[PDB]
Every structure is written in structure tokens, then in C-alpha cells.
Design a protein around this motif. Structure first.
Motif, PDB file in Angstrom:
ATOM      1  N   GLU A 150       0.763  -1.157   0.035  1.00  0.00           N
ATOM      2  CA  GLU A 150       0.039   0.028   0.003  1.00  0.00           C
ATOM      3  C   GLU A 150       0.808   1.365   0.073  1.00  0.00           C
ATOM      4  O   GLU A 150       0.451   2.384  -0.605  1.00  0.00           O
ATOM      5  CB  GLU A 150      -0.856   0.144   1.265  1.00  0.00           C
ATOM      6  CG  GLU A 150      -1.960  -1.185   1.064  1.00  0.00           C
ATOM      7  CD  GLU A 150      -2.704  -1.139   2.456  1.00  0.00           C
ATOM      8  OE1 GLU A 150      -3.271  -0.110   2.710  1.00  0.00           O
ATOM      9  OE2 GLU A 150      -3.055  -2.258   2.925  1.00  0.00           O
ATOM     10  N   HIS A 151       1.842   1.299   0.828  1.00  0.00           N
ATOM     11  CA  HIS A 151       2.432   2.667   1.043  1.00  0.00           C
ATOM     12  C   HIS A 151       4.178   2.467   1.305  1.00  0.00           C
ATOM     13  O   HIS A 151       4.527   1.460   1.869  1.00  0.00           O
ATOM     14  CB  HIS A 151       1.970   3.009   2.564  1.00  0.00           C
ATOM     15  CG  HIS A 151       1.670   4.441   2.752  1.00  0.00           C
ATOM     16  ND1 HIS A 151       2.949   5.147   2.978  1.00  0.00           N
ATOM     17  CD2 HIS A 151       0.790   5.284   2.888  1.00  0.00           C
ATOM     18  CE1 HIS A 151       2.814   6.326   3.285  1.00  0.00           C
ATOM     19  NE2 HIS A 151       1.421   6.510   3.394  1.00  0.00           N
ATOM     20  N   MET A 193      -4.186   2.990  -8.882  1.00  0.00           N
ATOM     21  CA  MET A 193      -2.761   2.897  -8.828  1.00  0.00           C
ATOM     22  C   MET A 193      -2.379   3.019  -7.321  1.00  0.00           C
ATOM     23  O   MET A 193      -2.885   3.828  -6.754  1.00  0.00           O
ATOM     24  CB  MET A 193      -1.865   3.870  -9.844  1.00  0.00           C
ATOM     25  CG  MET A 193      -0.751   3.597  -9.798  1.00  0.00           C
ATOM     26  SD  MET A 193       0.279   4.976 -10.505  1.00  0.00           S
ATOM     27  CE  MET A 193      -0.204   6.135  -9.739  1.00  0.00           C
ATOM     28  N   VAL A 194      -1.731   2.129  -6.934  1.00  0.00           N
ATOM     29  CA  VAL A 194      -1.206   2.036  -5.542  1.00  0.00           C
ATOM     30  C   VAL A 194      -0.244   3.170  -5.536  1.00  0.00           C
ATOM     31  O   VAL A 194       0.673   3.361  -6.232  1.00  0.00           O
ATOM     32  CB  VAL A 194      -0.271   0.854  -5.251  1.00  0.00           C
ATOM     33  CG1 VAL A 194       0.266   0.719  -3.914  1.00  0.00           C
ATOM     34  CG2 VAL A 194      -1.306  -0.380  -5.373  1.00  0.00           C
ATOM     35  N   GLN A 195      -0.558   3.992  -4.523  1.00  0.00           N
ATOM     36  CA  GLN A 195       0.291   5.566  -4.660  1.00  0.00           C
ATOM     37  C   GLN A 195       0.376   5.922  -3.043  1.00  0.00           C
ATOM     38  O   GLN A 195       0.234   7.167  -2.765  1.00  0.00           O
ATOM     39  CB  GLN A 195      -0.577   6.441  -5.179  1.00  0.00           C
ATOM     40  CG  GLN A 195       0.404   7.545  -5.810  1.00  0.00           C
ATOM     41  CD  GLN A 195      -0.542   8.588  -6.697  1.00  0.00           C
ATOM     42  OE1 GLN A 195      -1.470   8.375  -7.398  1.00  0.00           O
ATOM     43  NE2 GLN A 195       0.465   9.811  -6.894  1.00  0.00           N
ATOM     44  N   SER A 196       0.393   5.248  -2.039  1.00  0.00           N
ATOM     45  CA  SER A 196       0.339   5.383  -0.791  1.00  0.00           C
ATOM     46  C   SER A 196      -0.345   6.596  -0.171  1.00  0.00           C
ATOM     47  O   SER A 196      -0.136   7.354   0.572  1.00  0.00           O
ATOM     48  CB  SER A 196       2.015   5.904  -0.571  1.00  0.00           C
ATOM     49  OG  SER A 196       3.041   5.154  -0.833  1.00  0.00           O
ATOM     50  N   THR A 197      -1.520   5.905  -0.389  1.00  0.00           N
ATOM     51  CA  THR A 197      -2.912   6.864   0.106  1.00  0.00           C
ATOM     52  C   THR A 197      -3.275   5.947   1.284  1.00  0.00           C
ATOM     53  O   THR A 197      -4.133   6.615   2.084  1.00  0.00           O
ATOM     54  CB  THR A 197      -3.828   6.918  -0.635  1.00  0.00           C
ATOM     55  OG1 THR A 197      -4.401   5.730  -1.339  1.00  0.00           O
ATOM     56  CG2 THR A 197      -3.380   7.612  -2.018  1.00  0.00           C
ATOM     57  N   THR A 198      -2.986   4.818   1.563  1.00  0.00           N
ATOM     58  CA  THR A 198      -3.523   4.024   2.750  1.00  0.00           C
ATOM     59  C   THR A 198      -2.406   3.260   3.484  1.00  0.00           C
ATOM     60  O   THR A 198      -1.396   2.844   2.742  1.00  0.00           O
ATOM     61  CB  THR A 198      -4.493   2.808   2.389  1.00  0.00           C
ATOM     62  OG1 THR A 198      -4.133   2.122   1.253  1.00  0.00           O
ATOM     63  CG2 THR A 198      -5.986   3.682   1.921  1.00  0.00           C
ATOM     64  N   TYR A 199      -2.317   2.879   4.722  1.00  0.00           N
ATOM     65  CA  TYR A 199      -1.133   2.169   5.316  1.00  0.00           C
ATOM     66  C   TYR A 199      -1.828   1.167   6.145  1.00  0.00           C
ATOM     67  O   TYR A 199      -2.539   1.489   6.938  1.00  0.00           O
ATOM     68  CB  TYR A 199      -0.292   3.111   6.101  1.00  0.00           C
ATOM     69  CG  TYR A 199       0.821   2.571   7.044  1.00  0.00           C
ATOM     70  CD1 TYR A 199       2.096   1.896   6.386  1.00  0.00           C
ATOM     71  CD2 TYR A 199       0.755   2.655   8.628  1.00  0.00           C
ATOM     72  CE1 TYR A 199       2.733   1.212   7.268  1.00  0.00           C
ATOM     73  CE2 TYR A 199       1.749   2.056   9.302  1.00  0.00           C
ATOM     74  CZ  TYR A 199       2.816   1.408   8.574  1.00  0.00           C
ATOM     75  OH  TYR A 199       3.402   0.832   9.560  1.00  0.00           O
ATOM     76  N   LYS A 200      -1.368  -0.199   5.950  1.00  0.00           N
ATOM     77  CA  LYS A 200      -1.826  -1.129   6.558  1.00  0.00           C
ATOM     78  C   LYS A 200      -3.459  -1.087   6.985  1.00  0.00           C
ATOM     79  O   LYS A 200      -4.160  -1.500   7.731  1.00  0.00           O
ATOM     80  CB  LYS A 200      -1.247  -1.147   8.204  1.00  0.00           C
ATOM     81  CG  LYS A 200       0.229  -1.734   8.130  1.00  0.00           C
ATOM     82  CD  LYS A 200       0.881  -1.763   9.675  1.00  0.00           C
ATOM     83  CE  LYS A 200       2.388  -2.200   9.413  1.00  0.00           C
ATOM     84  NZ  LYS A 200       2.787  -2.529  10.773  1.00  0.00           N
ATOM     85  N   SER A 201      -4.191  -0.972   5.751  1.00  0.00           N
ATOM     86  CA  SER A 201      -5.829  -0.812   5.551  1.00  0.00           C
ATOM     87  C   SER A 201      -6.051  -2.139   5.510  1.00  0.00           C
ATOM     88  O   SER A 201      -7.408  -2.506   5.615  1.00  0.00           O
ATOM     89  CB  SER A 201      -6.059   0.298   4.573  1.00  0.00           C
ATOM     90  OG  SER A 201      -5.949   0.003   3.498  1.00  0.00           O
ATOM     91  N   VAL A 221      -4.234  -4.586 -10.503  1.00  0.00           N
ATOM     92  CA  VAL A 221      -3.576  -3.762  -9.949  1.00  0.00           C
ATOM     93  C   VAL A 221      -2.462  -2.977 -11.418  1.00  0.00           C
ATOM     94  O   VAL A 221      -2.387  -1.791 -11.185  1.00  0.00           O
ATOM     95  CB  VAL A 221      -2.466  -4.393  -9.172  1.00  0.00           C
ATOM     96  CG1 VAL A 221      -1.291  -3.601  -8.628  1.00  0.00           C
ATOM     97  CG2 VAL A 221      -3.304  -4.934  -7.959  1.00  0.00           C
ATOM     98  N   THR A 222      -1.917  -3.858 -12.238  1.00  0.00           N
ATOM     99  CA  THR A 222      -1.270  -3.526 -13.205  1.00  0.00           C
ATOM    100  C   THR A 222      -1.659  -4.315 -14.277  1.00  0.00           C
ATOM    101  O   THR A 222      -1.735  -5.595 -14.222  1.00  0.00           O
ATOM    102  CB  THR A 222       0.238  -3.178 -13.218  1.00  0.00           C
ATOM    103  OG1 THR A 222       0.703  -4.579 -12.586  1.00  0.00           O
ATOM    104  CG2 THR A 222       0.601  -2.049 -12.128  1.00  0.00           C
TER     105      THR A 222
END
Lengths: 505, 506
Positions: free
Chosen positions: A269-270, B16-24, B128-129
Motif C-alpha cells: 500500500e505505502h 494505482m497504488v500510491q501510498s494513500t493508505t497504510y496497513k488498511s 493492479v497493473t
């Protein structure tokens, strides 16, 4: 005039120049290293020792020597006895400093004031002594002069005869610690299922040390960056590499060739998943380096430093309102600093709040997207040390203008990126980031940065057959040793340094 | 329009995975799917689409992550609409998908996957891609045995899109094993108090020539000179793992222009057998641990069949031939006077002159004791050794002086020979070790005899002038050891992005 000549043959077994070691015998004698001489069971035993002559002198009817092997040294002495003739005392007194000797000696426990030798409790009574190899009597500099605190052997003189300089306590300890950093880096990542890779240092195009490559030209890689990303697209989940890196673009802090410690990994995710690994990796390394007290003190005695602090105290976290990510605690700290957890307690400050902190002391204020140069990195590190008490911190969410073409921009604000820098004693040591794993956005950022990716078509193509989100970071090995120990020059932590003016030894 | 929005939650292209969530969310790796506590659970997996097809009201996929694969299916039922079965059928292979799916047991195992006991019932699937629908080659073709019938991928096409090739079972396994070789090499030596060093690859004089600011410099062929010089700074024992460069224009199945050297140098008390003792124990340690990685070995072997390496004589063969045992004082009665150090590692040593005699048993053109054993001769020797002694690994002891570099110490009793050895794996040289000349004057004298010019390396010679330790060492090619261990046909199969005179890309 011939019985006197026969006395030469009698004393050959007691002292003189031994025949050159040439693999004529195997395990015929027991060789005790200097490091083992304080083993209690060796007291009053006769042992055979190979060591360097640190110093030796004939005085009265006796000879006195200090024998050395790296960080271990011991006093030795001989006196005229029935077994030991006066000619041996003369021979011992005149052996050249730095010669290698084989000594047969009794280990004696002694009560005497502490000297410079590290085996204080014992002294060798020498029964036989032979030179293994003889040193030139002219040294390029003495070990003692090379060991002095800075205010003298200048650095270029020490580097030109590095084999001599490496014999000092601090230089030996520096490179033992360098080996430990590599060891702890790899062990941490192997424990976490990172696979080691080896990627080529010769590359087709500058992405610039140009080399002749058979009929054409090639170049040296600045880093394994492009390859460590490409291998993830071969479905390897996480990788590390330890190997040379080359930078053509001369300060006391930088080299043209050095060693990169590189990491790349899938992310779910991050990029905080990358930062979590990086912080845990540094915590692991720092915790284990701290246990090498012998080496640390042997560095400190010539190059004094204050031991690195990399954790905030729980008390300071509470007093200032530092947030705690793993606990869901939102910061009340004015600069909104956070730690991930109360175990490693490692400081993170958002880049814009780093600017705000610098602006408390600056007369010419910085905008939130301005770049922090080298003088202002040191100033930020000092302000962080004074406010939070730590020599180590992360600055999070760097401006887009300051980052390479492969750095993922923030979704909410493309002025910034999904990236961070780490700092030790106010100097940058590692950058990490999420990469752009989409080919079209990767080309778009490159075009925005007026970077032409035509020379690295294969790298771009490697994202076109399905790509994993990923990120990573790199660390300069010599630099992390330099900053951890507080050394003044990165060349003290590179065995045979390379810079624009130095290609030898 | 509102129906299309409902379906967007079920299937389609994810943001696109872009660091908008963490461990969600909890992402379960494909490797974990056979854990018994996942049965009847609906889980989130990220995987490669290996294959996908539609057949009526159902879609069938194989999802993959490296060596782990599992069958997935969907049927039009409940909240799964026909639109999603259509979507699954048209995903391009090698796309990466996030699937929400129930882990179900099955009666008849799905033998085409590694998770044969279970099957995924897909409830949601998003890309995802997306991969191109045009692949440089298929995984199927790139995985096919050269002997099996069907299309194969040639090596240049393989290396030109190495990121695709690495996804195959065998290629992925080769490079996991390469990592393990490095790991066990370093751990053995760390355990024995060897210090890691990093010496420069840029040198001031030779033959890869590079522009170096206002002057020229060169790439080091190996860390040989530096690893000796560091011992003269009183480091007792060192190793290095790093790039090495060969400037010969040789395009063969065995040669790379850039590869990775595993290098060792150490003090010796008396004898270069101390070096050979370490080298044999080091190889024993590595081979014994590589043998435990059965998953990887089988994944190489299914495409590139090989017989597992034998590196030890059996105790019985030792007795049958009267091989000597050094640590027990057992003098050989073997006609070729072979020896092992000890009954634990049982690693064969044959004196070079007896190696010559062994070759001469099948040669019509007899070799002299000082003649050189070329590359056709090394493989013949290894076959004779395998047939007589039963081992794929052996060392040949005391090489002729004419075959060795200027820094090799000569034998005192017979200067025709040197205090040196070679090690062989499957009949091919993998490592040379020797005592070095630690006396500056004899080192210049041997270089003069060999017509070698030491003017470009005065600092190396100078490093022995201020007192020098007797010492010796050896080097090992990393890609070559993986290649010979696994019996691979081409060294490029064991080098991630190979370099040879014609290849500098990728």
C-alpha cells in the motif's frame, strides 16, 4: 678463528633470521596468537608467538620489546642466562621496528603499572627469537605519529602507505566496524527474507565514467537502482545488494568510488512499508555496533566522539507531544513529529515542518517546497538534536523538484513525493521512496524533468508486462561508518580511497 | 449507470497504488494459501495471472507468485454477475490482480498448480497493473525442457527480456541458490573470524580502460593485489565479495566479461595446506547447506536435469583404494597417492604429477610431469577421477611454476613446481589457491623470470617491505560455481544481467 665461527652455528637455533616460510612443514609447531596470551592456562607455559616488533631496545644487559598484532600487544624481555647468550640480547636490540618475529617465550604474570600494551597482566620472558621478515629501517612515518589526535602525518601520506596506517589502533578498529556494518545489514535483511542480487556495474548508456568496451563504449553504473527495480518485475519479492558504486559528480565527505548498501521491495500500500524496514534495519545495526566496545574505544582514543543517540526518550516524547504511529497517537508537537513505536522511538518530521523548524532561526525564510542544501541540513540536524535530543531522524515527503524521475509523486499534491531522507549527525545518509511502477507515468515524470529515457529503454520496458508496486533505499557504507563514528573525513573509512585526485594505491 | 457503478466495486481496474493508505488491508501471499486456518475463509491475494479462460457461465484462472500457484474460478451466482466472468476471461496474462476469494478444499487435486489441494472461489477481482497482451515469449515456452517437444526460447531472446525469464521456476530457483551460495560463503568465513573488505575496482594501471577526469584509469580484474596488501596492515584473515572483470574477447558458453568474485586471503603459520584446509571446509559447508534447499533444486532440475553433486569419497572407497588420511597419519597406498584431510569431509587431493600419470593411462601422447593440463585435459581428468574415486570434486596439488602467476611461491625442494593447487567441480576448474611470495626481492625475481613488468604496481611490492606476514588465498567465480554445481549448459543462466563482449544490455 674457527671455533669462533662454530659459535655462529651454535646460536643459529636460538636467534637470528629464520629461513623464509615456504611450506616445508605442516602443523609441526603450535603457534599461539598474541590475542590468546591472557588465557589463564598459559601462565608459566612456554609458547611460540609470531608478532610485529613495535619497539625494541638493548638496555643494560637486557633487551626489552613490545610485540604487537593489531589491537593486542604484550611486553617481552630477555636477559643473559645459561640458555640465552649476550649475543641474543644484542640481536634483539637491533631488530628493525615493524619486523615480524617468531618468539619462543615463557608467559609470566606480572604486577606493574598499566602501560600502552593491552596485555597488562603478563610479560614474555624470551628464550628464542628469529626474524620472519625484516622491515626496512626507514619507515614512511611511525605508528605513534600516525595515531595522534588531530589539532602529524597528513592524510595523503597515510593513504600512500595505507598498509602501515592500517596497523594503528583506530584505523584497524574503523575497518573492523565497517565489516560489522556489512554483516549486520545483510543478516537483518536475510532474516526478513530479502534475496541477495548481483547486478552489472558496466552499463550501456549513462542513464558518467565512460570506458572502452571492445569495439564500442560502455559506462560505469552510479548505483544498482535500475536493476534492483527490474528484478522485482521478475517476481523476486525483496532484494538487497552490496557492491561498488561510482559517482563522477572533491570534498572531505565524498568519494568517486565507494560501496552501496541497497534495498528494494514490493509494497502492498505505502512507502512507509519501506521506511519501516529502513528504520528497523538502522536500529538493528546501531544496537549491535554498540556492543563492539573494544573497537569503539580504540576509535575514540584517537578520534573522540560522543556515542550516537538515535532514540528519543519516552519522557521527551511525552513532554513534547510526539505522535506514535503504532499506537494511533496523533501529535500535539508544534512540528508534528512522530515515532513509529515506543521501542525504537525514531523521529520522523514531515518536510514542510522541517522547513518551519529551520525558519525559526533563519532571517531569509524558506518556502515549503524550497530545497534544503548542505549548510541547512546541518542546521536542521542541530535544531533537531536540541529540541528532540536525537542525532538520527527522518524527513518525510520531499519536494518533487528534489527527487529523481523514478520517484512516485503524492496523489494529493504532486509538488511532493512518496519519499524520505534519513540524517545522522545532521548529514544525509539514505533516501528512500516508492517508485513509479507504471510506464506511462514514469515517462511523464521523466519528460517533466527533461530527462531522456531513450538510453534506458529496457528499464522502462521491464514495467510493461505487469509490475508490482515497490520502493527501496540505498546507504553509503563508508559514509555511514564516518557519520556513526563522527569522523572528519570519509577517506578514514575507505580502505584504498578513490577521489578525482587519487587512483593509488 | 448506477448498475455500472455497483459493478466497479466488484471487478475492474483498481486505482494505482500510491501510498494513500497504510496497513488498511491484510494481503495474504500465495505461498500461505495451504495453511489449514485459511480454509473456508475469504482472503485478499495479489498475484500474477498465469492463464485465464472463459467457458460459459464460468471463468478459470491460474494465479501465481514465483514458485507458488493456485487455481481460481468464478461462477455466475449471487453477487457475481456474468460481466465479471467476462472480465476475468479477458485479463491479459502476466497482469497483476487483487482477488478477494474463498479458499476451498477440493477432492480431485489440481495437479497443474503447486497448491493442488485447494481452489479459490473468486468474489472480487481488480487489476493492479495490466500487462501487454503481446509478450516477448510465453512462460510455458521459456520453461520447456530442451529435450521436450515444442517451442523453446533461445538464450539471447531470454536475456533481452530477462524480467520475463526470471519468472520461470528454474530461472527463479537458480538465482535464489546464487543468493544462498553468497550467504553460506560469508557465514562460514565470519564464523572463522575472517573480516570483510572492500577494495577498489578502479585502478591506475593494468584492460578495460576508462576516462577518469583528466586522465585514464582501468578496471581491476580481481582484488588479488589489495587482499594481500591488507594483510600487511595486520588484518589476519579477509574475504571480499564483489565484481571482477575479464577483458578477453571470448564469447563461449563459459565466459563472462563481468562477474562476481568470492575472494579469500589469510596468514599462514607454516604451509599453504592451511589455505587448502580452509577452502575445503568452506566448500563442504556450502555444499552441505545447498543440499537442504530441495524446493529450489527440484525447480532447477525439472527444466535442466542434473545429477546431484558428489563432493565426498565414501569411507568404503577410501579403504578400497588405500587413499591416505592426513589427520590420522594414514599414508596412501593408492597407486595415484591420493589423500583426504579427514574422515568427515573426505575431500580428494591428488598431487599434480600423479594427475599427469592418471591422464597418461588413457593417453597415447604421454604428458611430461611439467606439461600443462589444458581444458580438454581437465574434463578428461575429472572423468577419470569420477570413475576411479566416485567424486565430482577434487583438488590437484602442486602446479608447475610455468602455469602460475609471478606472486606464487615456488616449492623449495623443486622450483619447477609451486605451493599452489586447483579445485575442480565436474571436471572444470573452479578455484586456484596458493601461498604468495611475501619477500619483496624474491617477488621481483620471479616477475623478472616470467618477463612480467612490475613498474605499474610499485605500491603492492612496497607493501611487503615494512615487515610482511606469510600468507595465501584463493578466489571463486560465483556464477561459475552455481553453473557447475547445477550442471547448467551456459554461465549466462547464472548471471542476472549477463555481460559478454557482445552484450551490455539490459
Amino acid at each position: 678463528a674457527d671455533e669462533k665461527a662454530a659459535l655462529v652455528e651454535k646460536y643459529k637455533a636460538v636467534f637470528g633470521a629464520a629461513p623464509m616460510v615456504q611450506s616445508t612443514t605442516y602443523k609441526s609447531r603450535t603457534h599461539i596468537p598474541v590475542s590468546e596470551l591472557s588465557r589463564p592456562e598459559l601462565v608459566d607455559k612456554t609458547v611460540l608467538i609470531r608478532a610485529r616488533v613495535s619497539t625494541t631496545r638493548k638496555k643494560g644487559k637486557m633487551a626489552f620489546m613490545v610485540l604487537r598484532d593489531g589491537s593486542d600487544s604484550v611486553q617481552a624481555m630477555a636477559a643473559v642466562e645459561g640458555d640465552v647468550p649476550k649475543e641474543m640480547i644484542d640481536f634483539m636490540g637491533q631488530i628493525a621496528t615493524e619486523s615480524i618475529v617468531d618468539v619462543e617465550a615463557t608467559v609470566c604474570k606480572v604486577e606493574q603499572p598499566i602501560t600502552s600494551t593491552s596485555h597488562s597482566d603478563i610479560e614474555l620472558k624470551v628464550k628464542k627469537i628469529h626474524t620472519v621478515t625484516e622491515s626496512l629501517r626507514t619507515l614512511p612515518f611511525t605508528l605513534e605519529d600516525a595515531s595522534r589526535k588531530e589539532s602529524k602525518v597528513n592524510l595523503d601520506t597515510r593513504l600512500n602507505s595505507r598498509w602501515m596506517d592500517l596497523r594503528t589502533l583506530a584505523s584497524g578498529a574503523i575497518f573492523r566496524l565497517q565489516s560489522r556494518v556489512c554483516q549486520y545489514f545483510r543478516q537483518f535483511l536475510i532474516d526478513k527474507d530479502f534475496c541477495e542480487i548481483h547486478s552489472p556495474k558496466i552499463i550501456n548508456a549513462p542513464s558518467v565514467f565512460k570506458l572502452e568496451y571492445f569495439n564500442r563504449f560502455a559506462y560505469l553504473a552510479q548505483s544498482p537502482q535500475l536493476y534492483k527495480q527490474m528484478v522485482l518485475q521478475g517476481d523476486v519479492p525483496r532484494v538487497f545488494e552490496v557492491g561498488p558504486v561510482f559517482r563522477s559528480e572533491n570534498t572531505h565527505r565524498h568519494l568517486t568510488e565507494f560501496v552501496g548498501l541497497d534495498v528494494e521491495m514490493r509494497i502492498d500500500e505505502h512507502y512507509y512499508e519501506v521506511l519501516d524496514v529502513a528504520e528497523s534495519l538502522f536500529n538493528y545495526i546501531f544496537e549491535r555496533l554498540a556492543t563492539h566496545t573494544k573497537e569503539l574505544k580504540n576509535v575514540c582514543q584517537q578520534y573522540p566522539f560522543e556515542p550516537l543517540v538515535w532514540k528519543l526518550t519516552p519522557e521527551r516524547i511525552k513532554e513534547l507531544g510526539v505522535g506514535v504511529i503504532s499506537e494511533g497517537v496523533v501529535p500535539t508537537d508544534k512540528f508534528q513529529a512522530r515515532v513509529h513505536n515506543m521501542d525504537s522511538r525514531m523521529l520522523r518530521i514531515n518536510y514542510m515542518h522541517c522547513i518551519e523548524l529551520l525558519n525559526t532561526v533563519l532571517d531569509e525564510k524558506m518556502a515549503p517546497t524550497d530545497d534544503i542544501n548542505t549548510t541547512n541540513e546541518k542546521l536542521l540536524g542541530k535544531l533537531v538534536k536540541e529540541r528532540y535530543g536525537t542525532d538520527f531522524f527522518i524527513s518525510d515527503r520531499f519536494p518533487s523538484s528534489a527527487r529523481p524521475f523514478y520517484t512516485m509523486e503524492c496523489k494529493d499534491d504532486v509538488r511532493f513525493t512518496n519519499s524520505y531522507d534519513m540524517f545522522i549527525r545532521g548529514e544525509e545518509i539514505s533516501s528512500g521512496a516508492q517508485r513509479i511502477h507504471d510506464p506511462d507515468l514514469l515517462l511523464a515524470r521523466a519528460k517533466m524533468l527533461n530527462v531522456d529515457l531513450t538510453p534506458i529503454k529496457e528499464y522502462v520496458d521491464s514495467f510493461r508486462l505487469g509490475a508490482w508496486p515497490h520502493g527501496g533505499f540505498g546507504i553509503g557504507l563508508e559514509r555511514v561508518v564516518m557519520l556513526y563514528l563522527g569522523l572528519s573525513n570519509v577517506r578514514l573509512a575507505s580502505l584504498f580511497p578513490r577521489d578525482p585526485q587519487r587512483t593509488t594505491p
